[PDB]
Amino acid sequence: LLDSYEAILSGIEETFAQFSIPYDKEKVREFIFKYSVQDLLVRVAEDRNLDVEVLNQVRAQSLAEKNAQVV
Numbered sequence: 001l002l003d004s005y006e007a008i009l010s011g012i013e014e015t016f017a018q019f020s021i022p023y024d025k026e027k028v029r030e031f032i033f034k035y036s037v038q039d040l041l042v043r044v045a046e047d048r049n050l051d052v053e054v055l056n057q058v059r060a061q062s063l064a065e066k067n068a069q070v071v
Contacts, residue, residue: 010064019050
């Protein structure tokens with residue numbers, strides 16, 4: 001049980017809001033247990049008429065993922 005996933009998930013929230021996207025800890029924690037984060041940002045981009053590459057640039061710049069740690 002590594003806390004790495006909450007360290008990550010924190011930055012997904014703050015990615016999603018930069019695009020007005022409805023975050024949901026439930027859906028996102030479920031998704032990353034079944035698929036990878038790569039797939040998540042593809043799936044919502046496809047839905048939202050975005051481009052996964054942009055969501056990756058905003059994913060890259062979370063202070064949350066820089067601040068947080070792994071046990």
